[PDB]
Design a binder for this molecule. Sequence first.
Ligand SMILES: Cc1cc2nc3c(=O)[nH]c(=O)nc-3n(C[C@H](O)[C@H](O)[C@H](O)COP(=O)(O)OP(=O)(O)OC[C@H]3O[C@@H](n4cnc5c(N)ncnc54)[C@H](O)[C@@H]3O)c2cc1C
Ligand SMILES: NC(=O)c1ccc[n+]([C@@H]2O[C@H](COP(=O)([O-])OP(=O)(O)OC[C@H]3O[C@@H](n4cnc5c(N)ncnc54)[C@H](O)[C@@H]3O)[C@@H](O)[C@H]2O)c1
Ligand SMILES: O=C(O)[C@@H]1CCCS1
Ligand SMILES: [Mg+2]
Length: 1217
Amino acid sequence: APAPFADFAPPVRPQSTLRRAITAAYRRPETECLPPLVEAATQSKEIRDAAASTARKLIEALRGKHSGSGVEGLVQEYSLSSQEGVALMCLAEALLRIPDTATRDALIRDKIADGNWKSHLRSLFVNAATWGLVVTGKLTSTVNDRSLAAALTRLISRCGEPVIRRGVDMAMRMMGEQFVTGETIREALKRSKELEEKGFSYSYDMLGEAATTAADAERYYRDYESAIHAIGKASAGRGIYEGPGISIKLSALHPRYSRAQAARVMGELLPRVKALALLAKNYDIGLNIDAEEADRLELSLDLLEVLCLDGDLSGWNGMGFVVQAYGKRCPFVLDFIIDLARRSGRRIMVRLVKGAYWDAEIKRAQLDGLADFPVFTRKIHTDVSYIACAAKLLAATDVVFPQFATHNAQTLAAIYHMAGKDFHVGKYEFQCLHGMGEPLYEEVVGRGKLDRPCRIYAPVGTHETLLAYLVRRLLENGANSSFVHRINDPKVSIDELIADPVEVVRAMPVVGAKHDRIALPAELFGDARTNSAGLDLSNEETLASLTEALRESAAMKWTALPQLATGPAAGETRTVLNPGDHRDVVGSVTETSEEDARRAVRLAADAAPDWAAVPPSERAACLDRAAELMQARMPTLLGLIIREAGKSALNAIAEVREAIDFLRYYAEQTRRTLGPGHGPLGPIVCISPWNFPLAIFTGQIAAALVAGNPVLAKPAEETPLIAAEGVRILREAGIPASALQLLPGDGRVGAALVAAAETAGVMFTGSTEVARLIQAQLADRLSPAGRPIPLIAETGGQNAMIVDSSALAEQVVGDVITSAFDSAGQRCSALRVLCLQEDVADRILTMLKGALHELHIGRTDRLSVDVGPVITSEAKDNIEKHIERMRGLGRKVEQIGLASETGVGTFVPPTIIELEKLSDLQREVFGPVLHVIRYRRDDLDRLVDDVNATGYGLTFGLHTRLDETIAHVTSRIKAGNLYINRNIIGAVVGVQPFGGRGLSGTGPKAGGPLYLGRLVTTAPVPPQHSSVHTDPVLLDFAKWLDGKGARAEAEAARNAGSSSALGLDLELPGPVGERNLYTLHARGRILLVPATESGLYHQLAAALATGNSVAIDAASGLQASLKNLPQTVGLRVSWSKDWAADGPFAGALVEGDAERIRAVNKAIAALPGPLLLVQAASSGEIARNPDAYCLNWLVEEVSASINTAAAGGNASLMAIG
Ligand SMILES: Cc1cc2nc3c(=O)[nH]c(=O)nc-3n(C[C@H](O)[C@H](O)[C@H](O)COP(=O)(O)OP(=O)(O)OC[C@H]3O[C@@H](n4cnc5c(N)ncnc54)[C@H](O)[C@@H]3O)c2cc1C
Ligand SMILES: NC(=O)c1ccc[n+]([C@@H]2O[C@H](COP(=O)([O-])OP(=O)(O)OC[C@H]3O[C@@H](n4cnc5c(N)ncnc54)[C@H](O)[C@@H]3O)[C@@H](O)[C@H]2O)c1
Ligand SMILES: O=C(O)[C@@H]1CCCS1
Ligand SMILES: [Mg+2]
């Protein structure tokens, strides 16, 4: 067997001194980056004055020829509102999808103008967010398609064919001549002659990036190759400076362009770039490598190095490379490139830009919990960085060819004067973007201006292809901080535009301070708690240190023992094997006898007073100390999780982060809530699943402990070692051994603990079928006070994602691959059923299957592994039996081929199964098996019914740009965690409180504010837990009670209406570019089992105040107590003689003495389907205690996470500069 982690993440090449200086700056604090840049960018007073004078002259010329835009003139002529202008351009876009010009004009004249555009023309408004930027300058992430439809009807009925004609002509010009230089490379070359005669040059961009499949990458390759021929033929020997060149993106040329797949990149991507470069060499044209995301920078340097040292490319100086001045590594990258140019003798063309992905870099660093950003956070810092790096490049013009890409007249003027009076073509150049920079550079190019050349970056492509690049440009043009936006702002003076960023930064009190309004990832939650920290698996220093820590973790002799209050106990011992390779022994577990499990509960009960007496603040301090210990131990914990549970490094990082976040969140919630009157339940049994073997394990135990309960921790039999280490950490943090006992073993140990007389509460996460067995055990039992033993049972899912024809296929496929196959589908949240609108299903399926075949399955101690094993041979057999049954029914089955190395472990290949109906699924299949169904748009409401009809309700995803569809689907779906335009596996503690309904859970949600209150006898009021809304049926019921003379019950009903938090609607703090919402809804239909009239009235008031309907036990004989109900109340009331026929219920309220409660609890447990959260009270308790039935457990929590950056950028951060 290969030694564990012996090949985890070896670098492409040994890191030179220059390469290590780059990596060292990756996330350097901003206050350290700026001082050396300020020093390097300093120019003399005489030059600063001359540059300000040049910049003013350029800006005065720009403002003096600035004319109104074509769209603005169109809006003016026809008095359009903003929505009308957007709707008009969407219509024009759709009309231009009709090729035959005469056919289009016939449709306009005889159909569109005459009225119902709906009857003749995929939503018309799929790209309205883009047109919104064009019309209004603002980015909206989703489209209000009902507003746009109304606006289009209004404008057509008001203005007729003439406005439609003007819109079509405007859109045809912008999409054919402004957003691109041409539709094809031949068209773009024909249009370039005019400005080349004026002294400009060109670099053509065949719009293309982020290949998803091998076929995508092949298509982009032959596009680049065909463009090089056309450009080279046109260049006709003009050479690399006067003649045109090409720009490429490495992400276009391989579907797995990432550091994790570096070996594939060097083996498969590099030869393709070399082949393109050889053709560019033969024509003697430039070939530029564009810069992309920050985690691709250093990888791209390995390709640049090999290409510049390759003798087959010698004699050609056209290789070019972009460096992004908004990045903290920029000057060190330039040092590396300048040295590479010296070593190779290649005069590398270096394009200095600021950078195009700023919003996304802020979001990514926050999501990943990294130390700092890889980009600056103040715009002026990027400006100083640019000028500092320009000074470095201008000192090296013998060795490199600097290309200064900017539309900022202040930046340009500073460099023009920095470069001085000696110039020749080939020394350096400026660059600009087509349709953006020509007004500025027509004041620069030419003997009559500044006599410096400019190369125009010219996008080339069809209307369809122009997508992502266009929104990046329009974001750029619209950002409050952008020069091209400020030049048009009449409130911004020329003196403000020519302000010298170098001197402004120098004069600030704290030079280089982070932006005040952008939180470091550690500070996402402010004073509430410290965010967990992750690890950057693109950082070579991190990979090197992690490799050592992982190897060291694999040499440790991990054990798990029955850790009773009195010390470790003896038992049956066996080895724990790596699921990816059974030859790899990870450790040993000693399992707990049923006798010792019962003994542990008795020890827990004897120790309960001593732990309850530890004040809540000190219990929370133990949790916070445990979190610090797990954070410090993360690399070792990663290694154990990788080998014991079959997790990849990325997934193990997320797992340890979640454990840290649980500890800190429950600690803070404790400090916000728990006081002397919130008494503990007593010994709590925590039974946890194998698949999140540290995070869910820790979360349940931490919550029970901090609420003052001693815990019996029973980890899954598959994953005892990481559980034992978590208990060791909690004990080191100060949790006494009597308060936290570890009982390894199988379900027999869990059952023995559940059944023990002193067990006062059970926290279960696992399969629905096991939860039902525990529900049956507990229905036999009552507390010493005669009440049900509280059970939190968080169970399985049958999770769907709905995708309509407005979604972006590339986004969908990435989120589907992650949601369905991450962790080999062994997430309770994993995507099980993908629902594709019929019109786009074939294209998305083709793309999905292509992405599937790029996944690497194997033992997870290699960074290049995407999908690990399933946990056991029994799990594998159960999953494969499902796949074969489906294959036997003739369903299409797509499967990855598995390498021979997988035979030593238990692997199932990622699988796509195309189904005909959702009813083709019976139970959760906990493996890498995605089911695909198709639907017609008009059947969307029925499809949501079908998703709800499974009885599950855990996670749910929707990909759409259309507000009407978002409103429709999210109001009708019944699931606990919703996700819009993102993956569906998010469970960030305190951000997406996690947990579902129906067959998926009882609640309350883990990682949410109602959780701790379930673990004490009297629940506290959670932070922010209130609602000003009163249920109207409750109000009608209270009036009916008063009319019947039941004055005390009517008062209790009004009080319940006020106390209810139904209607709570909050936004939770989290990362930028996401909205995370938390809401309280009705649970559904509550089963009422009353004994007395007053008890019935109290039960009904509690259920109605929380928005529920009820089914009342007809055997109570209390029908005559509810005569003459208002129709509003009657609609919510039914009577049930056969409870099993009238479900599923969403909870129950029971009145009676102890043996009546026990009898009813058994009858409720026998009902088919979901576990019911039952609350019971005696008649006397209802009389004495207004909170006899707690309203916390009669509402349902819903979490919704919306990716607001999905349209291609972040509107909120556009105002942050
Ligand atoms: C010809 C050409 C080629 C280009 N090629 C690439 C490329 O391959 N890869 C790439 O990533 N970019 C590239 N760019 C740059 C990018 O597309 C933008 O055009 C450029 O960043 C805008 O800078 P500016 O000097 O025109 O305008 P300015 O208004 O002076 O500067 C705007 C820039 O400031 C930065 N910024 C904004 N807010 C903040 C903030 N709060 N904190 C820190 N920085 C901030 C951003 O980089 C933003 O784009 C290219 C640009 C041109 C003209
Ligand atoms: N809703 C959530 O938040 C969530 C999270 C993770 C996993 N899950 C669900 O958990 C399942 C996968 O985890 P698993 O395979 O470890 O679940 P499982 O039901 O097989 O076992 C979970 C735990 O119950 C114990 N157990 C088994 N039989 C028992 C019995 N008769 N009495 C008492 N305890 C018994 C097991 O030993 C284990 O500790 C999946 O169905 C998944 O959907 C849900
Ligand atoms: O948005 C983009 O594509 C960047 C700007 C020009 C090339 S890289
Ligand atoms: Mg099991």
